[PDB]
CSV table of C-alpha atoms and ligand atoms in Angstrom, one decimal:
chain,number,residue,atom,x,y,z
A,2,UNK,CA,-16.7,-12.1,-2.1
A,3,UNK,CA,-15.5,-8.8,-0.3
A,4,UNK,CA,-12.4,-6.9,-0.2
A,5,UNK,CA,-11.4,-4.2,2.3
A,6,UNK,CA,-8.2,-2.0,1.2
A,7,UNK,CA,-7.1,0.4,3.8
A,8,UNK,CA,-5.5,3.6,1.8
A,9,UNK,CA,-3.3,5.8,3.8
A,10,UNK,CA,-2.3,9.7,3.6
A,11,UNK,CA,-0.3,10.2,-0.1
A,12,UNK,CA,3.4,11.7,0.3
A,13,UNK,CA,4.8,12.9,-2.7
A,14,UNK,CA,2.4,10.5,-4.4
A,15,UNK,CA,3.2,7.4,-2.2
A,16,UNK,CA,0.7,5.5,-0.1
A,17,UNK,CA,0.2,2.5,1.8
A,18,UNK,CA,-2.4,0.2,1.1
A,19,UNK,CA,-3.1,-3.1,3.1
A,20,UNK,CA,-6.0,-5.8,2.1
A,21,UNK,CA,-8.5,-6.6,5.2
A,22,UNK,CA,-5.7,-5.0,7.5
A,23,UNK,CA,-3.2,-8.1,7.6
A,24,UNK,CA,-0.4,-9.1,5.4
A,25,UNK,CA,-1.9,-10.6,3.0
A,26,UNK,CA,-0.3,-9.2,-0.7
A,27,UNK,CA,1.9,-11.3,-3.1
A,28,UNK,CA,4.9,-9.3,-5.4
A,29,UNK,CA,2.5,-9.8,-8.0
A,30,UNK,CA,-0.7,-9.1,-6.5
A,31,UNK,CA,0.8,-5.7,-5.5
A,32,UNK,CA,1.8,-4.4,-8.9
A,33,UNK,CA,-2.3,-5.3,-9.9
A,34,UNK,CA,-3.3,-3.6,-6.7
A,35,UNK,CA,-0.8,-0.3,-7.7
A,36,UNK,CA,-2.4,-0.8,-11.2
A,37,UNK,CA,-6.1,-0.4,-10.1
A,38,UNK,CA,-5.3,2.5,-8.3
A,39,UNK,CA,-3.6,4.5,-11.5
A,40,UNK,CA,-0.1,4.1,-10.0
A,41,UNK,CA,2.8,2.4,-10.0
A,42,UNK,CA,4.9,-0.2,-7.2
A,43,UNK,CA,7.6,3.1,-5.9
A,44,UNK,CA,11.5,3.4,-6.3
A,45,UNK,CA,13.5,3.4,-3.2
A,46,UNK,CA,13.6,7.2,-4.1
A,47,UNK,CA,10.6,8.0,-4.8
A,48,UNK,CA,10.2,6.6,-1.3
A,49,UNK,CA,13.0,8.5,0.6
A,50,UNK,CA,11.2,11.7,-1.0
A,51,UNK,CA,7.9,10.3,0.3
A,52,UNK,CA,9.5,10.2,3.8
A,53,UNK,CA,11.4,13.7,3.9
A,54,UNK,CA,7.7,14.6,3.5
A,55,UNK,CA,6.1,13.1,6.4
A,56,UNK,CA,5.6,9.5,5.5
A,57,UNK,CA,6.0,6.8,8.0
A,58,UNK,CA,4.1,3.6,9.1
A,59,UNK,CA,4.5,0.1,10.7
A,60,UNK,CA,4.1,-2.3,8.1
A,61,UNK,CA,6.0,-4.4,5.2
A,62,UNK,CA,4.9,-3.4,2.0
A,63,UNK,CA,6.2,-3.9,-1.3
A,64,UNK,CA,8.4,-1.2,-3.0
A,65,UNK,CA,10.0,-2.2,-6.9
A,66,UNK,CA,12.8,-4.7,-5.6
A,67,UNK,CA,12.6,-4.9,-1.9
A,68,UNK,CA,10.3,-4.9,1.2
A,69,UNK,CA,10.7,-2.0,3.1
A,70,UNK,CA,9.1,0.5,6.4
A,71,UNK,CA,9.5,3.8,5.8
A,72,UNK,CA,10.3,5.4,9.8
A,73,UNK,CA,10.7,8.7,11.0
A,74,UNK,CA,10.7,8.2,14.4
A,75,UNK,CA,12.4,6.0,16.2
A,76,UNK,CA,9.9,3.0,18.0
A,77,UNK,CA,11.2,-0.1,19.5
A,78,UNK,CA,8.0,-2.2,17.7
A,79,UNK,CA,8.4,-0.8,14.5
A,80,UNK,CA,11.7,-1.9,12.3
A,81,UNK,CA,13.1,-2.3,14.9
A,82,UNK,CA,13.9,1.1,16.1
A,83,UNK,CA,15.3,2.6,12.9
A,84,UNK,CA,14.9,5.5,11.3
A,85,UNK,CA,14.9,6.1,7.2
A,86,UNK,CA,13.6,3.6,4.6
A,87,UNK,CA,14.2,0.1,6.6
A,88,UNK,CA,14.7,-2.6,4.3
A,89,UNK,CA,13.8,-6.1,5.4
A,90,UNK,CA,16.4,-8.1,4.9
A,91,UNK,CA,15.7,-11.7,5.9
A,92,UNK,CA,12.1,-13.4,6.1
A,93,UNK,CA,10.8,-16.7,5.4
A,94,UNK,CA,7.5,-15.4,3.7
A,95,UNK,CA,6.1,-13.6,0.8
A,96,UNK,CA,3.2,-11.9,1.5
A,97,UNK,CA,3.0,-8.2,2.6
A,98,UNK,CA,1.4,-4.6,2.7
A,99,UNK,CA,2.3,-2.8,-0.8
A,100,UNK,CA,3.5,0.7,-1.2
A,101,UNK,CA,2.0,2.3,-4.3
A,102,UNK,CA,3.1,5.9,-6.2
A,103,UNK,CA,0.5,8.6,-7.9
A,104,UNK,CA,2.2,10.5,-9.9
A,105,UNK,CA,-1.3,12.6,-10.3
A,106,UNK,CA,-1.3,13.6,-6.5
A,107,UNK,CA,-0.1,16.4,-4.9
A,108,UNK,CA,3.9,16.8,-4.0
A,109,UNK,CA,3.5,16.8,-0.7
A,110,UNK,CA,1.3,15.5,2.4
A,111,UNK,CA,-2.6,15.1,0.4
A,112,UNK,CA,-4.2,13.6,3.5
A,113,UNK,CA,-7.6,14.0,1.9
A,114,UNK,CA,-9.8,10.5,1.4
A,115,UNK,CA,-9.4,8.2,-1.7
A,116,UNK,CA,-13.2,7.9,-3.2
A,117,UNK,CA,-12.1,6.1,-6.3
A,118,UNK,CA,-10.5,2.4,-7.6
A,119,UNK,CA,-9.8,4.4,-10.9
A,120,UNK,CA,-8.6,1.3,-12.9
A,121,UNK,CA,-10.2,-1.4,-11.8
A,122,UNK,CA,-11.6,-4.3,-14.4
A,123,UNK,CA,-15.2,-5.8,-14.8
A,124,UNK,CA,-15.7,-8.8,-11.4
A,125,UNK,CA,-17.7,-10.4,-9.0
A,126,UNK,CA,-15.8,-8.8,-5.9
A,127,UNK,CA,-17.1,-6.2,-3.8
A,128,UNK,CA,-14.1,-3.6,-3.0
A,129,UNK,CA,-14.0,-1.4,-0.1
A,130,UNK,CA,-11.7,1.6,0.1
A,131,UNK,CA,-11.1,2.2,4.0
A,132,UNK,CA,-9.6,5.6,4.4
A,133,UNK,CA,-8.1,6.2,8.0
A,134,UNK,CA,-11.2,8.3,8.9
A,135,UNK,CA,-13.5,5.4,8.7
A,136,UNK,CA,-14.9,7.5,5.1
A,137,UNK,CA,-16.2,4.5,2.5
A,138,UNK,CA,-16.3,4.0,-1.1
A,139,UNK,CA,-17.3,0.3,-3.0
A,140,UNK,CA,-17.5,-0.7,-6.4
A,141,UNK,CA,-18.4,-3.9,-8.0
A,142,UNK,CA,-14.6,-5.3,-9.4
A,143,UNK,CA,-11.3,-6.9,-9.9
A,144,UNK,CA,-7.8,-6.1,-9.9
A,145,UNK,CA,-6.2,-9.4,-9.8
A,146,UNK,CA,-4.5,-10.4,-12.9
A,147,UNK,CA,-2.5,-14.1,-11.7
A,148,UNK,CA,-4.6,-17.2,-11.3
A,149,UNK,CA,-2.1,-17.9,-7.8
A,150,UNK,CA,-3.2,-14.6,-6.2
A,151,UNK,CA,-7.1,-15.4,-6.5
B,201,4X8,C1,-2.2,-0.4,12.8
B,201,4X8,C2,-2.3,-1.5,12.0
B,201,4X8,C3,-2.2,-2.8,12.6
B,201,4X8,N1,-2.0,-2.9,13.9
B,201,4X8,C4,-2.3,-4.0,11.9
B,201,4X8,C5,-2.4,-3.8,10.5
B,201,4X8,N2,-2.5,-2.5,9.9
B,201,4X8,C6,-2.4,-1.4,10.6
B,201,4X8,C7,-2.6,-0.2,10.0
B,201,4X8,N3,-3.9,0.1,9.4
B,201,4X8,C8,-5.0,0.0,10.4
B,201,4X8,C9,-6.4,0.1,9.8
B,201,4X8,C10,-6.5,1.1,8.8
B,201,4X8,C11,-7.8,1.4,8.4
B,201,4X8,C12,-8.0,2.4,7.4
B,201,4X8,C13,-7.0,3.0,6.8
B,201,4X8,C14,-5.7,2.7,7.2
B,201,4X8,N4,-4.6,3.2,6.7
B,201,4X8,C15,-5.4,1.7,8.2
B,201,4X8,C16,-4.1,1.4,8.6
């Protein structure tokens, strides 16, 4: 009854975060998981801002209306060597990373740890915030609010 969510760098407020490092988030788990972290699924432009600041990674993840990879530079293996906010446009499935946005975090690159699930509710599962240096924080939760996603 564990849960690992690797947190990325904020940009302009917007992170990355990916549950036990596969695609594994539903649309509606996402907006929870944003939720439990004080923040918000982003707009495409809070997104675009996030990037002209630095942010980039390889992954799907939820943003408001649409599955996108933010990319600054161009690599063959991720979006398939695009640049900008890439939006996925044709998949089969429905399960992804999320994007999330902190309006509370700095307004540009905060690379520092995340040692907090602000918002999360009163459950059984054991949460793990990974940060990208390894650094650890658990608490004793839930965040999960649909039946489906449990
Ligand atoms: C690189 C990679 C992959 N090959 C498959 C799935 N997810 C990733 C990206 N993950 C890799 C693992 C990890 C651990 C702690 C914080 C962060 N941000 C990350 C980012």
């Amino acid at each position: 009854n564990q849960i690992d969510l690797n947190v990325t760098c904020r940009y302009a407020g917007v992170f990355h975060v990916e549950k036990n490092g596969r695609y594994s988030i539903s649309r509606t788990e996402a907006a929870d998981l944003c939720q439990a972290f004080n923040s918000t699924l982003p707009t495409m432009d809070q997104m675009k801002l996030a990037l002209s600041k630095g942010f980039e990674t390889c992954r799907y993840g939820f943003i408001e209306g649409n599955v996108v990879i933010p990319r600054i530079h161009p690599n063959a293996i991720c979006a398939a060597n695009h640049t900008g906010v890439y939006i996925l446009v044709t998949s089969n499935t429905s399960h992804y990373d999320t994007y999330c946005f902190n309006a509370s975090a700095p307004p540009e690159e905060d690379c520092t740890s995340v040692t907090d699930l602000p918002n999360s509710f009163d459950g059984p599962v054991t949460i793990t915030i990974v940060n990208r240096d390894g650094t650890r924080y658990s608490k004793k939760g839930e965040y999960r609010t649909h039946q489906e996603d449990i």
